[PDB]
Every structure is written in C-alpha cells, then in structure tokens.
Amino acid sequence: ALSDGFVRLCIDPSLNFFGEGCKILVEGQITDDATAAENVVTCVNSELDLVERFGQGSVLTESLRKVFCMCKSGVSVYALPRADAAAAVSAVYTLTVTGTALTDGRVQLYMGEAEYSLDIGVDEGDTPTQIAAKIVAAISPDFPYEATAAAGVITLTARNGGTIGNHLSVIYTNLGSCTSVTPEGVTVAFAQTTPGSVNPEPNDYASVVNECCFAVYVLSSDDTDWQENLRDWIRSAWDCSKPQCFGHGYVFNKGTLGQVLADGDNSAELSRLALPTTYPVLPYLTNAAYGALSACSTCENPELNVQGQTYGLLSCINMPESCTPGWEFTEVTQLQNNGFVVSGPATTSGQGNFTSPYIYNDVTNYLRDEKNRPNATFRDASSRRLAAATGVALATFLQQFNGLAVFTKNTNIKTGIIGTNLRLMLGKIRKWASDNVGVLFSEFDNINEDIQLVSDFDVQPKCVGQPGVFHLNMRYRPPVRGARINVNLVPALFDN
Amino acid sequence: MIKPMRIFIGGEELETYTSARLQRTKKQLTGSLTVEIFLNYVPSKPVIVNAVRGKEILVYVMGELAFTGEGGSDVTVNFAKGQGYSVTLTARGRTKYLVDSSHSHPTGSFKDTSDRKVIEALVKEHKVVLDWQGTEVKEPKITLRDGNRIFNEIFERCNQNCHFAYETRDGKLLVTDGTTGVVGEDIVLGQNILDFSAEQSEDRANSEITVKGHRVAKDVWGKNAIVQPVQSVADSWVGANIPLTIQHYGDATNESLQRRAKFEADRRAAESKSVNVTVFHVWDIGNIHYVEIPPEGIFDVMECVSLTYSVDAKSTLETQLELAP
Amino acid sequence: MAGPCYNPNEHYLPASFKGVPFDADSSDSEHGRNGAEAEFVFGERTGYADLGIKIRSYSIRARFQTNDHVALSNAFIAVLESTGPGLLVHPTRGPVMAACRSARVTDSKVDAAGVTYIDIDFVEANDTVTGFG
Amino acid sequence: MAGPCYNPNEHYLPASFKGVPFDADSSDSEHGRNGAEAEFVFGERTGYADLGIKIRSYSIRARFQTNDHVALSNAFIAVLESTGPGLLVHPTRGPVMAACRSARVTDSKVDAAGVTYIDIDFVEANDTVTGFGLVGSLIALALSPIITATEESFKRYYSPENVRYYNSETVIATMAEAVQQVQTGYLALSGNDTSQEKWTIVRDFRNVLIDEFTFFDPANSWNVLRNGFSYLDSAAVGQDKFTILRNIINWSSSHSELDGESADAQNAIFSAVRVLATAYLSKAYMETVASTVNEGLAQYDQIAAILEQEAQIAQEDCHDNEFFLSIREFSVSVARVMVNRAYNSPALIVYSFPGTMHSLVVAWEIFGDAKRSRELEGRNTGAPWAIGPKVIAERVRA
Amino acid sequence: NFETADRRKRFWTTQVAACGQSSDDCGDCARPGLQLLCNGEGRITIATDNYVAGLALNILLTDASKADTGCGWTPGNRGGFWGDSFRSDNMRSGSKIRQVTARGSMRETVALIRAYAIDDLKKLVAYGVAKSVDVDLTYQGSNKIDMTIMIQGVDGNESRVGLTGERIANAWVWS
Amino acid sequence: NILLTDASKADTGCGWTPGNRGGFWGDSFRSDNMRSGSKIRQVTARGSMRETVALIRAYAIDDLKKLVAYGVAKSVDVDLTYQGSNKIDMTIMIQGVDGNESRVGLTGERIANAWVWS
C-alpha cells in the first residue's frame, strides 16, 4: 500500500527469505558457559550466534560449525543441547618439549582438524624449553581442549566430560628434516594420563521432540546405549500405531575390526559410520559432515545416492595422508558386507600430504528381516527416502475420494449423480501407479496382481463392517541401480 | 537521416546525384571526383541544357568540407536503347591547370635562389595559393627544362629534398616533409573493419642505396667536383644484400645526397607494407591511427596515405584507406 | 470483410487510365525502403543505414465480357501504347501517375470464346525538370 | 501443443511497428553464423573457421477485416514508407529494432472483396555512429602529455645564468651528474650489442659531458635529458629495465640544501628526473605478464606512492600549480591501466582441489591439455609433484 | 604469498526490512532500505551482506523508461534514470512490472505480469551476478496471489571441472 | 585395457570434481586423434531393462571398434543375449591373422601391426 506509488501493482515482499522445507537436528553436549536451556529444542540461525549460545569449544559448537560449512543454504537447522553427567571425568593429555633450539626455525602442529593448525617461529637459537612451549599462546580458542602451559610441559584437558574426549593422534614436524628449518635438538613426546569416565543417557525423546517431523537426526556421541535410545525413537516415528513422522539417524562407531562388528544390531533406521582406531581427525566432525551433506542440502531428490567422489565428498574436512590405508582391503569388504559405511581418501597423494575423505557406499545397517529371512529391501539408504516419499505422495492422491458418494450394492450410477464404485476406484489408482514408473517405482512384475481394492463389507463377517471403509493392498519395487554381465572373450586365430 | 554528403556546383545544389565517388591520394598532385546524374528528355517539347564545361565544385561530407574543384572539367552523356539515359561529371583540384599547362617562365633559368622562391614564381601565373611548411633549401643553380610541365618540375625538384607535394581539401597546395600529426581513430578488428589485405613484398626493397653526381657550385672542379661527392645510406630492416645505385640530377651536395637517399628509403619501405581497409559508414589523409589484426600481428601505429568515399543508389556506403608506415 | 452490410461498389474506386474507363479485376502494389545492411568480420554486432525510398509499382488485371469485346479490348491497347505517362485511378490506392511497362493479352477461340483478359504492370512516374538540377 | 489448456492470446505478443498496432498472422526468422570451410587438395581432412554473427531477418503477414479496411491498410503503408528504422514488437521474438525492406499488398474486387493481405520483410538494424566507429584504447599509456608537462616545469625554474653567481658552479655540476646516471644505465643494458649505432651513441654521450658550455642553456639541458632516456628505454624490452630504473629513482630522492631561488634551480633537476623515470618504469611494467593478482597490484602501489610524493612537493606552497594538475591526472590514467592488467590480463582464478596433485595432472584436468602445465610453474609455489591443494590458473573461456 | 589474494571489496547493499515493516488492515509488508550497524563506542557503519539480493531489489523497485504512446507524458514522470546515458553495456535501468494494464480476464493480466518479471530480472545473468533466475507464480483466488523468485549463486572458489556453460564473471560476491 | 578404463566424461552443466573427470593425462601427446579408455560404465537406467541393455551393447561396440583403427584386428563384434532378471551374458569375438601372408586377392587390406599375429 504505497500512497505516492503507481496504480496497478503493489509488490509487498516478505520480511525473510528461505524455505525450510526440510529440517536437521544436531544433538550433543555443551559446557557451563553456554546460555541455552538444556533439553529444549531451539533453532539455530548462523555462526555469528554460536559460542555464546552453546559455550566455547563445546562438542555441540564444533559439530554445528561443520554443518553450516556444508549446507550453506537450503535447509533449516535445529539443536538439542545436553549437559554433562553427574560425575563425569575429563581426559588429560601431555605434550613434553625437550632440548634447546640450536638454530632459528619454525614449529607447526596438526591436531583434530585442519582448522586448529598452528605455526609459530621459534625465536632464535639457545631458547630453552621454558621459552618454548609458547605453543599454548598460539592454540586457537575453539580447540575443545584447554592448554595450561606448565613448566616445560603443556597439558591438554578436555572441555567436556565423558568418553567423548578419548580420540587423539598428533602429526608433527620437529623430528625429521624440513626446509622450514626444524630447530635442531628439539623433540616432542605424546602420551595420555587419564581417560573419560561417564556419559549421559537421556531417555526423554518423547517429550522434547514429541510430535515434530525431522528429516535427519545427527548424534555427536559414541555411547552405544545413547545411540540405542535414538534408534528406538525412530522406530516409533515409523510405527503403525499413529500418523508417521519419517526420519533417519546418523551415528559412528570407532575401534578395531572386532569391536566395530559387535555393534551391528540390525538397525534398519540408522547408518553407522565405521572408523579405525587411528583416525587422524576427531570422530564426530566427520559424522556431522556426512549427516549435513546427506540432509536436504543434497537429498531433495529422494532417489539420489550420496556416494562417489563427486557427490560423497566431505570437502569441509582436511587431513594428511597416512602411512597405511588404515582399513585393509580384506577388512573393507567385510564391513561393507555387514552393513557399514566406510570412507577413504579422495585422491591418492604423497605420503604426508593433505587430502579429503569421501564415502564409498551409502548403506544403512539393515540385515535379515522380521521373519529372520535375509534380504536387501532396505539395504540402500535411498530406499528409506523413497518409501517415505511414496507414502506421502500416495496419501495426497487418495484425498480426492474424501466425501465422495460410493455405491457398493447396486453398481449402476444414475444420470447426473457424482459418485464412484470399487472397479472405477481401482482403475484410477492403477493409472497413477503405472504413470509414476521411472520416478518412484520400477517396472512392475505383474501390475494386475500387485494392487487390490476391497470394501470393508467383504473382509468382516455379516453385520460387522462399516459403511464407506476400504482396504488398499499394494506392492512396489524401487528403481534398479545395478547390473551384472558375463564378458566371455574369444580371441580366435582366423578360421572362417 | 541528416545528409552525410552534400555536393555543390557553382552555388546551385545537386539534388539528383544518383552516385558519387571522391578520392584523395597523397602520392600525387591533385585529388579527383565523379558524380552521376539523371537527365530527362521528352520529344517535341523544350529542354534546357547547362553543359557547363567548367565551374567551381564543392563536396561536404557530414557537414564538413572534403574537396574543392576547378569543377566540371569533363562532361559526358551516356545513353542506351534499354536501361536509361544519364550524364556524368568529373572534377579535380584547383591545381588541375598546373598538371596540364606547360610553364611560361619569364626567363627560364634562375641565377641563385632557394626552392621556395622558385615554386612561387612558377605557380603564381595561374593564381593558386601555396601552403609552405617545410624547410627552405638554398642552391646555386636552378634551370627549369624548356616546356616541361609544371607537375613534372615541382615533383622533380621536391624528390631530392624529401618534400611531399600533395593537395589539401581547401584548394591550396601543401608541401610537407612529414605527417600532419592529426590523430585519428583506432581501427580495431572486429569493431569497424569490413575487409583488409596486408602485404610484404621483397621485390621492392634494398638494403644499401648509393647516390652519385657531379658538382656545379660557383667555382669547383677536379677531384672535389667528380669523385668526391658520393654518399651511401642503408635501411637495415631487410637482412639481405640487395645493392642499388642512383644518379643525382642537380648540384650535388653531401647533405642533398642523403636527403634524396632517405626519400627513396621512405618510398620503398612504404611500398613494402601496403594495407587496405574498408570501414563501412562514411578525417583527412596523413593522420595517425592504431590498428589491430592479431592474425598477422598488426600492433603498430599507422598513418593513412589515401582516402576514398563511395556511394551507390542501392545504398552501398563504404570508405577505403591505404595505410603504410 | 466482417458483417453482411458491405457494399463493394462503395469502397472500390472505378479504375481508369488517361481518362478511358476500364473494368478492373485485381489490385496489387509494392513498397519498400532501400537499406545498407552490413556485418563486420569477427564481430558480434551489425549495422544499417537508410538510404532512400524505393520506387513503387502497380499491377492490375482487366476483364472484357460485354458484347463485341474485341473492339473495346483492341481499342484499349492503343491507349497503353500512347507515348508518355498519364493519370491512373488505382482501385484502392487512388489517383496516381504511372507509365505502362508491359501488357499480356490472353484469348482463345475454343477454350474460352467471349472473354478477353489482359494483365498490366504499371510503374510510378513523377515528372522531372530537364536541366538536371 | 500438449493439453487442451492453451490460451494463444496469453503467449503471443500483440504486433506493432513504430507504435501503430496491427494484426499479425505469421512469424518467421533467419539466424545463423558465417563460416569459412575449406578443403585441401589430395587430403583426407577438412578445416573450418568462424567469422561472426549473420544478420537476422523477419517476415510477417497481416490481415485487415474491419469496415473501411482500405483506409487502415492504405494508412498503415504510409508508416512503412517512413524514414529510418523503428521499434518492432515481433509476436514471438519480443521487441526488436528493424527496418522494412519490402511489402506486397494483395487485393481483389470479385475473387476476394473485403479483406486485404500484406506480406512484409523486415531486417535487423542497430544504430551506429557516423565517424566509421569511434573507440578508446586501453592497452598502452600516454606519455606525451606528462613529458611535455615536465618540460614546462623544468624550463620554468632551471636557469643557471640568473642564479646568484656563487652557486652557478654547483647547479651545473648537479646537472652533469644527472646525465651521467643515464649514461651508466644505458651502457649496462646494451652490454652484448655490437651494432653500428652503439658506437655512435657512446660517442655522443662522451662528447656532451666533455664539453663545458653545453649545460648553460636550458634548451640544451632538457633535450639531452629527454633524448638520453629515450635511448635507455629502447635498449631492452621487459624485465631487463627494472633494476636500472629503480637505481635512478633512488638517486633522485635527494633534496637541495641551498637557499632561496638557488634551491629551486637544483630541486628542478631532482624532481624532473624522478617523474621521467617513474613514467618509463610504468611502461616497462606493461611489457610483462602479471604473475599473480596480488603481485600485479603490489607493483602498481609502488608507482602510485612515488607519483603522489611528487604531487605534494609541487603543491607544497603553490610552487607549480600547473605541474600539480598534470601529475594528478597522469596518476589516475596509470591506475586505469595497471589495475586492469593485474585483474584481467590473463584473468586468473583460484581453484580448490581435493588434495595435492602433480602439475601435469592439474593442467589436464582444468584445461584439457597436459602441455599447458608450463604456465603453472610461475604462479604456484611448491614442488612440481606437490602443487595444491589450491591452484591459481587461467579462466577457461570455451 | 598468503592464499587470500582477491582484494576486491564490497560496498553498501540495500536490505529487506532495513527500516522495519509497515502494517495495515490488508497485511504486513517490508520497508527496504540501508542498514546501520553500531559498535561498542558509537562509530556506526553500514552493512554489506547479501549483495545479489540487494541488487535484485533495486531492479524491481524502480520505474524504467515508459513506451511512447502518441499522446505523451509530462517531463517529470517519463521514467528511467538520467545516468543511463553514460553506461556502455547497451542496457537501460529499472523495471516495467508496474506498467501493466488490465487486459482480458484476471488470468491473462497475471500471466502478463509474470512475463515482465522474467524480462526484467533476466538482466541479472547479463551482468554476471547469477547464473540463472526463474519466477514461479500461482493463482489461487480472487484476492490471494503469491509469487516466488529463485536466484542461483556460485561459490567464490571454483571446485567443479568440466562445466557445459561458463563461470560467471563478477562472481567475487559469491551469490 | 580398453574395457577396464574410464574415458573422459561428457560435460553436464553442473560439473565434476577434478579428481575423477576421467580419461588419461597422457592422451595429449598422441597424434592419432583418439582418446584412451572406455565409456561403458557411464550408462544410466533409462526405460525398461531391455532398453538399458541395448544401450550398453552400443557403447561396447563403439569402444572396441578402436582395435581395427590401431590395426591389431581386422574385425570385432559382440553378441549379447537377455534371458531374464538376473542372468545376462555377453560374448566378444575378435578376428586375427597369421604372421605370414598366405592368401592373395583380398578385398580389404592387410592390417598393419600384424607382427603380433593375432
């Protein structure tokens, strides 16, 4: 309503700009400094608002930072902060510097993730370890560990209690030869002195996320019991006892091959990421990146697979190349055959150089069946997304029969009446199902038998059914994404 | 559209010029012109015939003067059993009487003077205003051949002093030893060119030019007048041995030998880099332009040597140039 | 034309040439303007230059059905061949000055006996002074 | 079209020409591109080239049916015959400027009475200036204005015959040193030359310095200084002149310690030399390819600072107002070109690879020809086998 | 040198809801304008975020030159901007969405409005700010009508290789 | 080698990561005007399985055709049979020649690079 404007048009734009067609929930722990209320879901706007709302260096803050770095736009983020246990212990690490710098040089470190790297120049020759260990003054504040800068040794104490702070491996410079002169006679030793003790086990998912639909759940923890509760909640969301709120969850498991294989509880509702014992990056950062990428930031098309070096590239993570593949090939096959997600370096490069990880197979943790038979109906992640899309799409289509007159006893419809019967109803549904081939379904083996419509008067006994209730029975198959062929080869020395 | 070209004869406008063409070249002594006119005739009724074999002619291009007869120096009336009946005209610079009149000098041999004071007494028999901007040269002897045309002697005497002799657009006579210095347009390929044709011919270049000639000074003879006056000048652009030798027609002076030598070098060098360009829609010759033809790598300043405006009844407006460095 | 209240005799002028009436059967014309389209080399832009008006031209077709058509048709040809241009009343373009440029007379004795068609090709001709400007 | 839900009035624009509406009945166009295909003799291969866009053409057919259609038709023709081109609203191609090229009007009184058809043939017509185009140059600097501006300033103050007599010797001695600096620079650049002109130039330098009265004339002093730099600039092309010119600028950063007018006669030599050196240094920077945007701009800042210093000196107390204006205008002209070179000469861009890679592989992935890897050496540090993970390369302009 | 070589900066940018919303019985609307940012000791500064979004607002909310009518307009409101006679890209500023006229049923008029909106925002691709733009307009009733404009941006640093099209110039605004 | 190597991928308009654009960096030095590798893994599920299989055969022929171009073999042909959902077979026939010419009056030509005699 512009008084001095032109006559015919009045634009009147909206205040904000975004769609929030899909939502993502990130769950983790916070620190004392955080102002956000615990166990209450809140919306997250941008990185400028972080730190204060979720403490400095907290597990939740780091996970959120990577989520925003991947889904720059096109998805709405939510956070569910949690508090530490009653008697949680904090892990402690030690880094001792020994010797005296004999020449000018520089010292550089890599810990946890590339964002926390530091590079400071040693002042000059004849600087003892006390003047060294200035590394503390150079460590970034966001690092989840607190540096104390003791007399000749620097101690790193986790900012969050529990087992979460039990994953380190340091790559360092001052032990070999480097053009960026390593101050000769200086070395560093790495060791641990105290592990984490206790993790929280919230069990109130029915009260805080009571009846809200979330597309993707992300959990930044390694407690098996905590993950088990999340899976049970997802089951209830997919349950048949009430309207559904579909969703999916992402978790990670770390350890040796034997330990990892013991966590496969045939979870059709979770995608368990498997990592080795010597991963040079903090675990939850990688898991958060995978969840963020797999969120609507990429999966607005349910049938899209998040794999390969083009789609499943966790660009927001940088890690140096390791001396050994980590997951041996004989072990990679076993993990994939057992329903686990395995990641590896994107580009082969020189030993010690920087690279990025990518995902081999986008597969859930589904195995066997309710009747204990083995199948792969929900093996691939896209199957879950496609199934949810089919349910919503089918329900919308059937809405046109709401309040429509239905004739069941005498199937002839008078002239001028607006109605329908069973056969006409079934025919219309087949047209919809067939037309959707190539978008939500593959070619039906027998379309004449995979769709059935029956009135409630034919299922219940005499004088027990209700008027105007139907039963629809359907079977479908998602699009095929594979093929095998034999390549019999016959180099034949000529003979016509 | 505002008439980009208007033609005037004797003050009465030509409203039926069905075609036109105006040329102005720096390597001659007079421009030219040509106008085609539609003429009518109806039998057994009166007609009016001008048939003026001489009168002033002017050409204005886009509200600017571009030629000055004098005019109507030639008239022809074509005719056909078929297509139609028309007339043609022609014109040349105000100096078009020098190019066709044998000199009538009062005596026929100067005693001692400079070239400028000679060019004034030869042309001022026909009332043509000179426009001198070069450097005066003093010589002991000048005797113009008996009956030699005016455009022969001026051209002959100005060749040994590196003086270009060409006509301006206002009706004067300009003798210059360089460029007018009026900076023009940057003719860039892909912007205004329509066609081009560069060239580099080795058949018209010489690395070493030698000049010889005796002396005529008031009192000189012997060795100082025969075997002494020899001078050589070299180009150094052609990397081959193509010697040439020239004979001097005049009173040889060591300064004059090089000046004649340099004049030949400029003529040969320009003739070995001739370019042509067409620039579609319709200021002056001798200007300085920039060109760009990466295919042959033209990235050097250029100076125009000839100009041409052409029109047609079927709307073909064009303009041609002959660049050379 | 729209509506059934049209009246062709009221909207089309009666043809003529040099004052002799004749029955018209068609009416065409040609107009235009002379351009100088030019496209540069290696360039993504073109140009244009308006350079005068184009000479018109009219074409008409006549039919003779009345009794003794040969006398009228054979007498009208003697007018098209008369020297010089003259006024022409185009059926739709109004009175203009034109000069006949050609005319084909078609006739037959067995295929079509009793009607003569004659096509014409006129050209605009404006008088000009003889002193060429 | 598909489905019965078409509304032709909603997808076809209403035709028009020069503002007068009319009813359209057809719509065509003719696009294309000019080729120069060539086939060789006895060969099994053929080539091709590109020569620019081909001029378009449009054709429309109009129908009239209303009463007195002759008047509307006979009145629309008067618009086609008008002069010059005008806007045309093509039914499908939208607004575009054209120029009618012909039109055939068909009508009848017995075969078809009451309807008039007209076929038109348009042509695209883009306006053009009359001086066979007029464009600007952005590939070279203009040194004639600054050099002439410097000449006036130098001539204005440097006058050894009017300074107080017990300072003429010192002022002249300074001038001799200034020329000597140019002489040293030239001899360093053309060390390996053995032409017949090097001997002549060297002799000319020696003669001028040996003679004593040559510098008593302001005209002679200026000519030697200007010409000496001209030979220096043409001695070598490219990076060879960076060190030589920087040394001269260093020598010309001093200021005179005399008093009164005598100081001006000496500061004139210093100021004139530095401005001339800076101008020629800028020209030298323009004969080389910018290795990187950051490096290319760093070179420019080095020049703007020097020119800015001279402007302040020439405007300290209205010492030379005209010179101050000339310096200021030259600096902005230099910026217009130096900035363009850094940001647009090869049009560099930063890439983001997923890890370190060989130079050969990087070249193939980006451009598609491993032979282009030679260009990546100068822009990216790191060994040839460890380039990355961020690479600076050229823009692909397929 | 340090990998942050791109030195190009970003000037002020118009933002939606800069001066709040104007409320009326019909509905609530934004009032775009410049944004002021304050420091801890005064020293106010203007914001510069969302460059492309700010540029889009300028295109839509400005009348362009009006087409000739044969009756004429007063010199005050002929439309356009006098500064467009110096630009060389051969384009005119502003938009013409406000110049539509009621033609045929309401459905036709709405369709025409969409046509103008595309024809105006198409300039964004020409400048090189965005690689694609599209507007979806829906008609659902006499008084309720909505329109959504979608713009496509790119990241500052190239990551993909082998694009069918071309990398848009002036992409240093990364949007 | 020809079959088990990914050739250069066609442009898509969205792009590919620099790591896996396909092809081989050494193809920029060869002068025969060809590119290495095969593109049989770049097919996509289109229509019924019968159509997809037919396309796969087309790519296989288009790749192995390079063998005749090099001159190693005088002819190649692949026969593919579809029998059901999960059982598919493909047989590749390659024609060879003896080391020493024995027949005279061949319609075609003796393939160069036949010193491998196969």
DSSP state of F110: P
Contact B218, B251 (CB under 8 A): no
Chain A contact present for E52, CB below 8 A: no
| Residues of B with Cβ-Cβ distance to C43 under 8 angstroms | 190-191
Q: Which of A116-135 are b and which e, b meaning 16 or more Cβ less than 10 Å from the residue's Cβ?
A: bebeeebeeeebebeebbbb
Contact A272, A265 (CB under 8 A): no
DSSP state of D152: H
Tokens 């033209």 belong to B298
Chain E contact present for F42, CB below 8 A: no
Least Cα distance to D51 among A237, C40, A397 occurs for C40
The experimental resolution of this structure, in angstroms, equals 3.4
Least Cα distance to D114 among D65, D150, D155, D161 occurs for D65
Contact A183, A122 (CB under 8 A): yes
Chain E contact present for A11, CB below 8 A: yes
| Separation of alpha carbons A65 and A44, rounded Å | 11
How many other CB atoms sit within 10 Å of the CB of residue B134?
18
Tokens representing B55?
A: 């009168």
Contact D107, C28 (CB under 8 A): yes
Strands D94-98 and D86-90, by their bridges, are antiparallel
Shortest Cα–Cα distance, A353 to chain D (Å):
7
| Separation of alpha carbons E74 and E68, rounded Å | 12
Tokens representing A180?
A: 């960026």
Contact A141, A57 (CB under 8 A): yes
Tokens representing D33?
A: 């591109």
Sheet holding B173-176, edge to edge: B130-132, B173-176, B164-167
Tokens 């005529």 belong to B216
B abuts D (3+ Cβ pairs < 8 Å) = yes
Shortest Cα–Cα distance, C111 to chain B (Å):
37
D abuts F (3+ Cβ pairs < 8 Å) = yes
Neighbours of chain E (3+ CB pairs under 8 A): A, D, F
In order, the DSSP letters of chain E are --S-----------BTTTT-EEE-SS-EEE--B--EEEEBTEEEEE----HHHHHHHHHHSSB-PPPP-SS---GGG--S-GGGGT--SS---SB-GGG----SSHHHHHHHHHHHHHHHHTHHHHHTS-SEEEEEEEE-SSS-EEEEEEEE---SSB--B--SS-PPSSGGG--
In order, the DSSP letters of A419-448 are EE-HHHHHHHHHHHHHHTBTTTB---S-TT
Helix (H) or strand (E) holding A455: strand A451-455
How many other CB atoms sit within 10 Å of the CB of residue C37?
17
Contact A33, A51 (CB under 8 A): no
Least Cα distance to B209 among B273, B259, B251 occurs for B259
Among E21, E98, E159, beta carbon nearest to A9: E98
Question: Which of helix, strand or coil describes residue B295?
Answer: coil
| Separation of alpha carbons A284 and A291, rounded Å | 10
CA closest to C51 among chain B residues: B315
Chain D contact present for E9, CB below 8 A: no
Least Cα distance to B298 among B232, B151, B200 occurs for B200
| Residue D196 backbone dihedrals phi, psi, to 5 degrees | -85, -10
Chain D contact present for F9, CB below 8 A: no
Suggest the residue from B186, B235, B277 to mutate for an interface test with chain D (most D CBs closer than 10 A).
B186
| Residue F32 backbone dihedrals phi, psi, to 5 degrees | -85, 0
Shortest Cα–Cα distance, D314 to chain B (Å):
31
- C-alpha distances in angstroms, E12 versus B66, D89, E15, E36, E55? 53, 38, 9, 10, 10
Tokens 């002839």 belong to A412
Helix (H) or strand (E) holding A234: helix A224-237
Amino acid at D64: F
Suggest the residue from F17, F38, F89 to mutate for an interface test with chain A (most A CBs closer than 10 A).
F17
Tokens representing C37?
A: 């389209």
Contact A190, A95 (CB under 8 A): yes
Alpha carbon F96 to chain centroid distance?
A: 16
| Residues of D with Cβ-Cβ distance to F25 under 8 angstroms | 360-361, 364, 370
Among D352, D357, D385, beta carbon nearest to A347: D357
Helix (H) or strand (E) holding A171: strand A171-172
Tokens representing D315?
A: 């405007």
In order, the DSSP letters of A128-154 are -TTTS-THHHHS-TTSSEEE---SSEE
Least Cα distance to A166 among A254, A232, A63, A91 occurs for A91
Alpha carbon A342 to chain centroid distance?
A: 13
Tokens representing B97?
A: 């009487």
Contact A130, A230 (CB under 8 A): no
How many other CB atoms sit within 10 Å of the CB of residue B167?
25
Q: Which residues contact E77 (CB under 8 A, 6 or more apart)?
A: none
Helix (H) or strand (E) holding A109: strand A107-110
- C-alpha distances in angstroms, C76 versus A189, C70, C95, C99? 123, 10, 19, 15
| Residues of C with Cβ-Cβ distance to B8 under 8 angstroms | none
Alpha carbon C82 to chain centroid distance?
A: 17
Contact A285, A264 (CB under 8 A): no
Full 3-state SS string of A326-391: CCCHHHHHHHHHCCCECEEECCCCCCCCEECEEECCCECCCCCCCCCCCCCCCCEHHHHHHHHHHH
| Separation of alpha carbons D106 and C28, rounded Å | 5
| Separation of alpha carbons C102 and C121, rounded Å | 6
Question: Which of helix, strand or coil describes residue B53?
Answer: coil
- C-alpha distances in angstroms, D153 versus D245, D264, D316, D327? 22, 11, 15, 11
Chain D contact present for A308, CB below 8 A: no
Tokens representing D388?
A: 């990355």
Tokens 């351009």 belong to C35
Contact A113, A80 (CB under 8 A): no
Tokens representing F73?
A: 């073999």
Contact B250, B264 (CB under 8 A): no
How many other CB atoms sit within 10 Å of the CB of residue D225?
20
Least Cα distance to C116 among C106, C104, C131 occurs for C106
Question: Which of helix, strand or coil describes residue B90?
Answer: strand
Helix (H) or strand (E) holding A396: helix A381-398
Over its C-alpha atoms, chain D yields an Rg (Å, rounded) of 35
Tokens representing B78?
A: 């074509």
CA closest to D355 among chain A residues: A355
CA-CA-CA-CA torsion for E48, E51, E56, E57, nearest 10 degrees?
-10
E22, HSE (Cβ side, Cα atoms, 13 Å): 11
Chain F contact present for D371, CB below 8 A: yes
Neighbours of chain A (3+ CB pairs under 8 A): D, E, F
Chain A contact present for F45, CB below 8 A: yes
| Separation of alpha carbons A163 and D147, rounded Å | 76
**Contact between chains at C48 and D113 (C-beta distance less than 8 A):** no
Alpha carbon A141 to chain centroid distance?
A: 26
| Residues of E with Cβ-Cβ distance to F19 under 8 angstroms | none
| Residues of E with Cβ-Cβ distance to A16 under 8 angstroms | 16-17
Q: What is the separation, in whole angstroms, between the first and last Cα of chain C?
A: 47
Alpha-carbon torsion (D79, D81, D86, D87), positive or negative: positive
Least Cα distance to C60 among C2, C118, C99, C6 occurs for C118
Tokens representing D387?
A: 């380039």
D149: left (phi over 0), alpha (psi -120 to 50) or beta: alpha
- C-alpha distances in angstroms, E147 versus A12, A267, D68, E52, E61? 11, 43, 45, 19, 15
Shortest Cα–Cα distance, B320 to chain C (Å):
15
Strands A216-219 and A248-254, by their bridges, are parallel
C abuts A (3+ Cβ pairs < 8 Å) = no
Question: Which of helix, strand or coil describes residue F23?
Answer: coil
**In degrees, to the nearest 5, what angle opens at C-alpha B67 toward C-alphas B63 and B72?**
120
| Residues of D with Cβ-Cβ distance to A346 under 8 angstroms | 354-355
Q: Helices (DSSP H) in chain D: which residue ranges?
A: 8-11, 69-80, 144-157, 168-189, 196-210, 218-235, 242-251, 261-285, 293-314, 321-344, 359-366
| Separation of alpha carbons B225 and B219, rounded Å | 10
**In degrees, to the nearest 5, what angle opens at C-alpha D172 toward C-alphas D167 and D178?**
135
| Separation of alpha carbons D378 and D398, rounded Å | 24
| Residue C65 backbone dihedrals phi, psi, to 5 degrees | -115, -25
| Separation of alpha carbons E162 and F11, rounded Å | 6
Bond from prior residue into A283 cis (ω within 30 degrees of 0): no
Shortest Cα–Cα distance, D18 to chain E (Å):
9
| Separation of alpha carbons A140 and A119, rounded Å | 11
Question: Which of helix, strand or coil describes residue B42?
Answer: coil
**Contact between chains at B185 and D83 (C-beta distance less than 8 A):** no
DSSP state of C73: H
| Residues of E with Cβ-Cβ distance to D350 under 8 angstroms | 3, 5-6, 157-158
CA closest to F76 among chain A residues: A491
How many other CB atoms sit within 10 Å of the CB of residue B208?
15
| Separation of alpha carbons B279 and C19, rounded Å | 52
CA closest to D197 among chain B residues: B236
Shortest Cα–Cα distance, A416 to chain D (Å):
24
In order, the DSSP letters of D95-144 are EEEE----EEEEE-SSSS-S-EEEEEEEEB-----SSS------SS---H
- After which residues does chain F break, using C–N > 2.5 Å? none
Instruction: Count Cβ–Cβ pairs < 8 Å, chain A vs chain F.
Output: 60
Full 3-state SS string of E69-93: CCCCCCHHHCCCCHHHHCCCCCCCC
Helix (H) or strand (E) holding B19: strand B17-25
**Contact between chains at F19 and D369 (C-beta distance less than 8 A):** no
Q: Which residues contact B18 (CB under 8 A, 6 or more apart)?
A: B36, B37, B38, B86, B313
**Contact between chains at B42 and C84 (C-beta distance less than 8 A):** yes
Tokens representing E79?
A: 């439309």
| Separation of alpha carbons B235 and B207, rounded Å | 5
Contact B48, B35 (CB under 8 A): no
Q: Which residues pair with B89 in a beta bridge?
A: B35, B75
Tokens representing B172?
A: 């004067």
Contact A59, A284 (CB under 8 A): yes
| Separation of alpha carbons A446 and A441, rounded Å | 13
Contact F36, F66 (CB under 8 A): no
Least Cα distance to D175 among D229, D212, D147 occurs for D212
| Residues of F with Cβ-Cβ distance to A440 under 8 angstroms | none
Q: Helices (DSSP H) in C20-84: which residue ranges?
A: 69-80
Chain F contact present for E157, CB below 8 A: no
Experimental technique for the deposited model: cryo-EM
| Separation of alpha carbons B185 and D131, rounded Å | 9
Q: Which residues contact B165 (CB under 8 A, 6 or more apart)?
A: B29, B154, B155, B158, B173, B174, B175
Amino acid at B4: P
Shortest Cα–Cα distance, D145 to chain E (Å):
26
Amino acid at D319: H
Chain F contact present for D44, CB below 8 A: no
Shortest Cα–Cα distance, A335 to chain E (Å):
31
Least Cα distance to F64 among F98, F34, F30, F38 occurs for F38
Neighbours of chain B (3+ CB pairs under 8 A): C, D
- C-alpha distances in angstroms, B13 versus A360, A438, B67, B77? 87, 79, 15, 20
Chain D contact present for A309, CB below 8 A: yes
Tokens representing D30?
A: 């003719």
| Separation of alpha carbons B37 and B7, rounded Å | 12
Least Cα distance to C50 among B307, D130, B14 occurs for D130
Q: Which residues pair with B238 in a beta bridge?
A: none
- C-alpha distances in angstroms, C114 versus A190, C79, C106, D109? 123, 22, 12, 21
